[PDB]
Write a protein that binds this DNA or RNA. Structure first.
Ligand SMILES: Nc1ncnc2c1ncn2[C@@H]1O[C@H](CSCC[C@H](N)C(=O)O)[C@@H](O)[C@H]1O
Length: 288
DNA sequence: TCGGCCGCCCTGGAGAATCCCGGTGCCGAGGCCGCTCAATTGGTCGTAGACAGCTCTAGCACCGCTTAAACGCACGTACGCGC
């Protein structure tokens, strides 16, 4: 599909003597997957600012990052003054809530409802955190969304962000079936999925003991995908974290139920997919 | 992908009812006394029934035919039973 045409801006590599840690703005953070991947790659983080509403996700971040995260409330409360007073950013990330962007809803409300239009909030903060002309600072940005969108919606998003959406499927690097569009200007945006041997490709490596995988991988019949003691059992939450690439026992931070952990892990990013995406940032920024 | 209502399980605390415990009155049961009439004793007959014997009726026992009816098997559908 060639509807628009624009070259991706490739920044020159900075040497090690002018190497600086990253300043990261994370708009729709949720479960703090971005800072988790950044800490796993061994990258020094000078400032991480997450604008999260949901208190369970804020609790996930406060437990798993120990007060490193600077919290904002709603993204509508962020102005241009808040962007220009919190220093210039080096990495902007986010994925808008796809309640009305997904075409799996028969009665979907579209891009221009209060769940979808938050994307434009992103664009506004994309417009504020972007450096002006004449500044050769390497500025990188990343937007995530689902594959189940309309043609006009994806076309308008691609025109607004001015980048080619690469499609990445979790089955090439992890044990999940979800294809996601990624807008951004990272180097090697469409390079193939370098599967890490430490990543759990099959489903059975993500299971616990005493459980047999019925399928080869899981999706995002009135049965259950795991047999347990010759009985079909629901897929566990820690096993869901191992499928989604998270560390073991990650989203157990408060007194939330099983349904809350499902709602948090469903909306979260895939750790291996991000690790692939954030990989070339290591040569552009600080290392630890 | 979303949270707005909606039935389930558990548990907690009001809440009416009931059990338990004394406190006081009350009236009917236990006990004592006269007496009176029926229980008892002694004695006498009369006959109802215990007992021996004889009889003779039918009740049990056995066998042989004879079919009348019970037992078993398949089957199907109509009512029992659950929802
Ligand atoms: N107006 C808003 N501003 C900021 N966050 C919001 C928001 N509305 C919803 N959110 C939260 O932000 C998250 C966006 S949903 C997708 C999250 C993202 N893909 C991830 O990496 O986890 C949701 O968990 C939602 O609870």
């Amino acid at each position: 599909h060639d509807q628009e045409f624009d070259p991706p801006k490739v920044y020159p590599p900075v040497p090690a003597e002018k190497r600086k840690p990253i300043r990261v703005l994370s708009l729709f953070d949720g479960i703090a997957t971005g800072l988790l991947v950044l800490k796993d790659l061994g990258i020094q983080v000078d400032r991480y600012i997450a604008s999260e509403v949901c208190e369970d996700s804020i609790t996930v971040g406060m437990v798993r990052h120990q007060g490193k995260i600077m919290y904002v409330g709603d993204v509508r409360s962020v102005t241009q003054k808040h962007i220009q007073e919190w220093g210039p950013f080096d990495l902007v990330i986010g994925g808008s809530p796809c309640n009305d962007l997904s075409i799996v809803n028969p009665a979907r409300k579209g891009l221009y409802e209060g769940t979808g239009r938050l994307f434009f909030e992103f664009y506004r903060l994309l417009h504020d955190a972007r450096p002006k002309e004449g500044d050769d600072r390497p500025f990188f940005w990343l937007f995530e969304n689902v594959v189940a969108m309309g043609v006009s919606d994806k076309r308008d998003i691609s025109r607004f962000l001015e980048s080619n959406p690469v499609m990445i499927d979790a089955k090439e690097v992890s044990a999940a079936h979800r294809a996601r569009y990624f807008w951004g200007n990272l180097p090697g945006m469409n390079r193939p999925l370098a599967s890490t041997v430490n990543d759990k490709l099959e489903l059975q490596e993500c299971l616990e003991h005493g459980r047999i995988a019925k399928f080869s991988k899981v999706r995002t019949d009135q049965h259950f995908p795991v047999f347990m003691n010759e009985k079909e059992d629901i897929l566990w939450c820690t096993e869901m974290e191992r499928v989604f690439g998270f560390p073991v026992h990650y989203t157990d931070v408060s007194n939330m139920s099983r349904l809350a952990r499902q709602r948090l892990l469903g909306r979260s990013w895939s750790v291996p997919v991000i690790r692939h995406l954030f990989a070339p940032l290591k040569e552009y920024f600080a290392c630890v």
